Ligand binder design. Structure first.
Ligand SMILES: *[C@@H]1O[C@H](CO)[C@@H](O[C@@H]2O[C@H](CO)[C@@H](O[C@@H]3O[C@H](CO[C@H]4O[C@H](CO)[C@@H](O)[C@H](O)[C@@H]4O)[C@@H](O)[C@H](O)[C@@H]3O)[C@H](O)[C@H]2NC(C)=O)[C@H](O)[C@H]1NC(C)=O
Ligand SMILES: *[C@@H]1O[C@H](CO)[C@@H](O[C@@H]2O[C@H](CO)[C@@H](O[C@@H]3O[C@H](CO[C@H]4O[C@H](CO)[C@@H](O)[C@H](O)[C@@H]4O)[C@@H](O)[C@H](O)[C@@H]3O)[C@H](O)[C@H]2NC(C)=O)[C@H](O)[C@H]1NC(C)=O
Ligand SMILES: *[C@@H]1O[C@H](CO)[C@@H](O[C@@H]2O[C@H](CO)[C@@H](O[C@@H]3O[C@H](CO)[C@@H](O)[C@H](O)[C@@H]3O)[C@H](O)[C@H]2NC(C)=O)[C@H](O)[C@H]1NC(C)=O
Ligand SMILES: *[C@@H]1O[C@H](CO)[C@@H](O)[C@H](O)[C@H]1NC(C)=O
Ligand SMILES: *[C@@H]1O[C@H](CO)[C@@H](O)[C@H](O)[C@H]1NC(C)=O
Ligand SMILES: *[C@@H]1O[C@H](CO)[C@@H](O)[C@H](O)[C@H]1NC(C)=O
Ligand SMILES: *[C@@H]1O[C@H](CO)[C@@H](O)[C@H](O)[C@H]1NC(C)=O
Ligand SMILES: *[C@@H]1O[C@H](CO)[C@@H](O)[C@H](O)[C@H]1NC(C)=O
Ligand SMILES: *[C@@H]1O[C@H](CO)[C@@H](O)[C@H](O)[C@H]1NC(C)=O
Ligand SMILES: *[C@@H]1O[C@H](CO)[C@@H](O)[C@H](O)[C@H]1NC(C)=O
Ligand SMILES: *[C@@H]1O[C@H](CO)[C@@H](O)[C@H](O)[C@H]1NC(C)=O
Ligand SMILES: *[C@@H]1O[C@H](CO)[C@@H](O)[C@H](O)[C@H]1NC(C)=O
Lengths: 515, 516, 515
């Protein structure tokens, strides 16, 4: 979209000579969209006196008369990359091993030279509280289990019936239990994310030459590169000078994951490669010092000194681990709901959308789908400008609402879940044209969706990736909620439009029954 | 504000025929403000050869000569809506019931067939640790309470004096206590908020016809609608083609509530106010999702049963920090001129009425944006010649004062623990609907700068800032009269009125422990 | 950068008379950069009929013929200020005092009239659980310490050997311990931060008068002031009318510190003044009610009722305090890593960059380094406009990568740490010109860096402050990673460029050795 165009006299005072020099250039300001990956528009600058701003006619090394300077602009796919900062490692699933010693002895002493669990060591020094804790059957439980049946739980399901082992309970040796903490061989590295940084590269293609026909005689293509890192560039010789000013505000802000911790499997039916097994967790799920129970990174001190530990069930204090959060999210997928810890809760179902990134192995970035119009200013030493835009018709070749990861299509669960709109369009023209995809005039209590733009090659089909997220703002269950999907060509004309119908199932809640 | 205007030759290559077609249109780029709800400006495009871009003179079906094409733009009120995702339910106030059995027996066994508290059940299976815990008076406390007075607390205020019940303590039956967890009948649904999405709709009114006088002869009004969902539209026939490019960056960013949990009262199937008045928005550090933590929203049976030294602690221990507690705590902050920390009205500034003007569904949440969010719109008309017609009407500041949260008292606030709210009354004294800009500047020392606000006021009507401006001070001292200058600008940046706003700040207060 | 310029007929209908009035003004829209603090560009408006829009020739009170109206724009340094909201106070380091009474008595009763620790008081009422807790040596430990050596830890390192004190253990008096909680005399005030607000002031200098030479005959300089608080202004009389529209989106977003708590030392080899001792903590490090252990603000109830408290080490439950987090971050500085709690983790090493702020004593703001181009619209009653920009060459006079606070330069630790790029440039011209500093064409797995702009006075040297943060997206250890640092003058020409080489050391991780 061209915003401003006109002539301007840019005078430059050379700082060494303090000397003035003025030229009248054409200053065009136009935006570049996120989904604008093809050369659909072109800027043509009328060039008088070609070659070396009229000519000396005619070895001779002179100049030619007239030709148009063609300029187009594309933008690489937009990503939101976060910088990583390592913090600490975490175990996939810490496991408690219960030992029932053969000689009915158990030692968890703090200065115990050799406990029945054994000491860990971070080097030559042994780690505190790594020796677990012991459990003995109380006199009250030996009394109950002998005559009747003890109603008090033991962590090792101890049998304290006197008849179960009379020859040793008589001599005071009661049944004992050892509870040691072990680590899964699978470790994870936890990196704290940073501030989001928009990353892209605008490609400015400039070609200078020697009813409906506009034939091109020999041109020489030159490509400029603009971006946040290099927000300006100039063409060969000194004709075109560009400058990236910045983007406009995004209508739907980025997800607030700046203060979360990215879990990456520490390397030593197969697991999927790259970031498929990655996770991104809030700090309320973690214990950095390891002194808290039922958190990622629970340590020895938390497991050894848990209150009434011998009276609790096995594996207590060891919940909420990376393996638990993973298995929990997989359950949410089977129920049409969105994961809460897997990084695919932003992609919408597939990990393939996150491998198109061009960063290093230890990097994280989400594909931006909101509108981010970057403003570029072109200043050419050529008076006369014209915009040439391709208009190709299109057709919506398919639209449907599907749950997370496409486990089932047609609808989702009202407020606990959300839907994902996959839209298939096809360029029916013979040229590469830009398109705008909008969802509007929905039924009641349906959340508005921001439009998306697709640059489709001629005769090719395209699809929204990642798809649009669809919510509903009530908890009822409707059989056919409606929305209108419209396909706009360039310069804002509707080439095709259909009505998208979907169901929402009612929401479900917890309940406790009192007695 | 008009930004760019000029002529441009837009050539369109029809993709089916690969055929070129060029036209010279006027491309105007202008911004639309957040608080711009009235038609104060108008763009007039000189239209030669009316009707069907000169005419064939003269059934005839021909064209007329000349008239101006009038175009205006308004913007709906701006909101920041967050998508909800349900997580779990939470009880308004879990209550501990203390039982003192008549037969002095108490059973909290894990496999106990029938405990003195009873098992809950999530269906047909009974919930673990729902049977509470029992307490017995230790031998040490029976020894103290019999002769002197025991200094050790019991959760049930047990009387373990032997003389208080000798016939049963002698046969070993000591006084016992049962501590069961119960739930308030009022439940709450907790929805995790999502990413903020700016939502609005720009209304482009276009009317084509067919000293100071500019009379309108018959016009036909056509309204276009642009927004984030539909960022472009075209008029009837093919005269005007619009496109919404986006907004500019906001100077004061939105509140970071993306990862918080919205608490909504769960319906049952002196009265409370309707809609979101009873809603709350909490940080995840106030919650226990698994319920295995004490003194958090959603504390479960396992946390209450296995609390360390539970029988030695006071009643209702581990049951603090609940939805009822956080609510009653915020109400106390209101009575002390401070701002709530959990009620969603801590963003509105005092009144819930500002949040019911939203047009979303029953289960939605949105805050009214007050920062400048200037959206850029590009107009391209097939009519060469353009003119901007803006209404300028004078105004007067009819009132300005600093008030605490919810207007419990005006005149000032508490320095750093609290903040003030600036209510400003203005009145359009002209006969036309003009736009205005409201600024607070040239303040005294250590006063935080405030971003300006814009008000579109109907002719002869009075307007007011809603929600009011939030005012802070960057020191902890107590001043009797801090000053700021409130200025009212008409359109095209002229000061019609200005007054000096004076307010006091009380000194901040801090906690203190006296050791012994 | 000038974006749009042209003529526009702005008609104004006076609301009182309903009367029309039209004038044709020049509407220039141009951006103002973040680092643009000098008058490098200038807008010159051709003014016909000077003095009072041709003249009446010739007391006379008439007008002159012709002169140019010079207009320049600068922007103050950009800051992101956060509003503070006080919450509660916190102690620098709560300390546990262990008492061993001479008479072997210990009382921690709830209704105890006078305990061996003593009651605190918030006024006239005494604070609950302020009397600490007592510890007695169990019969099991007296049995072990008498014959052999007890392997169970006591919090007071108690000696329960019967022979160590036989005359009192015989009469039942066992060794006892008192554990009271005390507070460091240094307190801290904790303020919850608010939403970030961009704060700046654009200075519009307008002076109206009355080969390379352009001499100035007497002008009168007038300065306008625009900003978020006052986004518009008009010149003396009614010539120029300005309006600040807003900034463009920032490419690298601000750090998400909105919901954190700022710790400020509560006033009564010396510490540096202002914010040098300040800290900014996540709410997961705090206990507001004080009922949690090993957190900032741990209270009496947490310390008194800690499970197995008498069996734990001294100072247990009292970790993770403001003194601990401070001493921990200082250790990260000595290891080339970035602090996690000190507010200097955003500045990059020096506190001097945070004292240039102009706020009150209780305020907090970070210097914005991302591009924030503000759009300003100028409308002058003078047809004819010209842009005069100074171009002075520059030279990169130094570039190096240094760890946090400059503890050592040359490189950093790959993912646990980050580097900081200090760049020295010098204006070699005789005029004040603007510059653009870019880092591009890096080696593999190097994170992209957004460009920065420097306004340098003539003949003066400038430096990046705060320096650019440099990350790497892999965990390997390389001896010489390369990037290209380029220096652009105004209107986008490369005056100087060098290649910046640096090393990255491999990352380090935790490890537990099992037994
Ligand atoms: C939009 O266009 C897309 C194509 O560009 C459509 O995707 C197609 O979806 C259909 C089902 O709706 C798939 O047909 C199925 O094919 C499988 C076997 O092929 C697949 O096998 C495995 C899965 O077992 C998979 O990993 C492979 O990659 C194959 O894709 C049959 O068993 C099914 O019965 C069914 O016929 C197409 O394969 C798929 N095409 C592509 C290219 O992926 C999409 O449905 C369209 N959406 C809308 C809303 O119109
Ligand atoms: C970019 O230019 C900067 C100057 O504008 C350069 O900073 C200079 O860095 C050198 C070291 O490379 C310093 O020289 C040192 O001086 C100390 C003694 O002076 C200092 O003493 C104390 C520290 O004990 C300090 O607090 C004072 O302020 C003094 O600065 C010697 O003991 C050292 O051996 C060494 O010679 C310069 O003093 C310093 N200049 C300034 C003005 O700070 C910077 O290195 C340049 N960077 C690049 C990449 O080129
Ligand atoms: C700005 O203008 C509004 C009105 O547009 C002012 O609100 C008015 O405030 C007064 C109090 O100062 C209200 O009068 C009171 O009414 C209550 C009954 O609700 C009565 O008990 C009191 O004795 C008193 O009479 C008045 O009703 C209210 N008007 C409206 C429409 O709400 C506001 O005070 C003005 N603020 C400034 C700073 O000028
Ligand atoms: C991801 O895959 C790419 C190629 O598809 C590979 O170069 C890269 O090393 C992989 N990274 C991880 C972390 O698996
Ligand atoms: C929008 O949909 C409603 C049905 O909900 C229909 O009545 C109306 O005509 C539609 N309007 C447009 C412009 O599609
Ligand atoms: C709800 O989901 C089930 C499958 O889980 C589906 O059969 C049903 O049709 C859905 N509800 C409605 C109203 O369609
Ligand atoms: C809020 O009030 C509106 C009408 O004022 C009503 O339509 C809506 O259902 C209410 N929502 C709730 C959650 O009470
Ligand atoms: C701002 O107010 C102060 C009084 O505190 C006054 O001295 C100064 O002149 C005022 N400045 C302007 C520009 O009004
Ligand atoms: C501080 O607040 C009290 C009421 O809490 C009020 O009476 C007093 O006037 C305030 N301080 C000043 C300086 O006005
Ligand atoms: C910081 O220093 C400035 C002067 O450099 C002083 O005016 C201000 O009071 C100081 N603030 C604090 C909190 O030390
Ligand atoms: C980037 O640097 C490499 C040296 O490793 C050089 O070969 C290449 O030409 C450079 N590319 C550009 C565009 O400067
Ligand atoms: C890694 O750091 C050490 C000091 O910690 C330094 O001596 C060494 O040079 C660094 N690595 C490389 C490759 O330079």
């Amino acid at each position: 979209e061209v915003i401003a165009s006109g002539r301007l006299e840019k005078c430059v005072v050379d700082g060494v000579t303090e000397e003035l020099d003025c030229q009248e250039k054409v200053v065009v300001t136009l935006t570049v969209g996120n989904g604008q990956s093809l050369q659909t528009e072109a800027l043509e600058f009328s060039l008088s006196c070609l070659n070396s701003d009229c000519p000396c006619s005619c070895t001779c090394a002179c100049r030619d008369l007239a030709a148009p300077l063609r300029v187009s602009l594309t933008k690489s796919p937009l990503w939101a990359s976060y910088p990583l900062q390592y913090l600490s490692s975490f175990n996939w699933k810490p496991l408690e091993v219960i030992l029932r010693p053969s000689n009915k002895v158990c030692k968890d002493g703090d200065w115990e030279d050799s406990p029945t669990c054994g000491w860990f060591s971070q080097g030559g020094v042994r780690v505190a509280d790594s020796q677990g804790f012991c459990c003995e059957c109380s006199s009250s439980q030996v009394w109950d289990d002998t005559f009747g049946s003890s109603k008090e739980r033991t962590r090792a399901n101890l049998d304290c019936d006197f008849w179960s082992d009379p020859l040793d309970i008589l001599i005071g040796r009661k049944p004992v239990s050892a509870h040691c903490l072990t680590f899964d061989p699978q470790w994870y590295s936890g990196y704290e994310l940073g501030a989001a940084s928009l990353q892209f590269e605008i490609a400015i293609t400039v070609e200078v030459p020697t009813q409906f026909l506009s034939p091109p005689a020999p041109s020489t293509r030159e490509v400029l590169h603009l971006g946040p890192s290099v927000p300006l560039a100039s063409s060969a010789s000194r004709l075109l000078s560009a400058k990236l000013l910045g983007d406009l505000a995004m209508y739907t802000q980025l997800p607030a994951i700046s203060n979360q911790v990215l879990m990456v499997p520490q390397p030593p039916d197969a697991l999927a490669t790259n970031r498929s097994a990655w996770m991104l967790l809030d700090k309320t799920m973690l214990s950095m010092d390891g002194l808290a129970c039922d958190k990622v990174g629970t340590g020895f001190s938390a497991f050894r000194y848990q209150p009434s530990g011998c009276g609790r069930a096995p594996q207590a204090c060891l919940s909420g681990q990376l393996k638990d959060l993973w298995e929990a999210d997989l359950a949410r997928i089977a129920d049409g709901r969105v994961p809460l810890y897997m990084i695919t809760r932003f992609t919408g179902g597939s990990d393939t959308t996150l491998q198109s990134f061009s960063g290093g192995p230890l990097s994280f970035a989400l594909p931006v789908t909101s509108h981010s119009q970057s403003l570029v200013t072109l200043s050419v030493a050529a008076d006369g400008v014209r915009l040439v835009t391709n208009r190709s018709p299109g057709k919506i070749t398919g639209a449907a609402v599907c749950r997370f990861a496409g486990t089932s299509c047609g609808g989702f669960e009202a407020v606990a879940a959300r839907g994902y709109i996959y839209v298939n369009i096809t360029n029916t023209g013979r040229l590469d044209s830009d398109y705008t995809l909008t969802v509007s005039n929905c039924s009641s209590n349906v959340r508005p969706i921001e439009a998306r733009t697709l640059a489709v090659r001629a005769g090719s089909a395209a699809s929204l990736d990642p798809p649009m997220e669809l919510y509903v703002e009530d908890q009822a269950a409707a059989a056919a909620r409606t929305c209108t999907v419209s396909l706009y060509d360039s310069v804002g004309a509707v080439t095709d439009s259909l009505t998208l119908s979907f169901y929402t199932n009612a929401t479900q809640l917890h309940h406790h029954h009192h007695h």
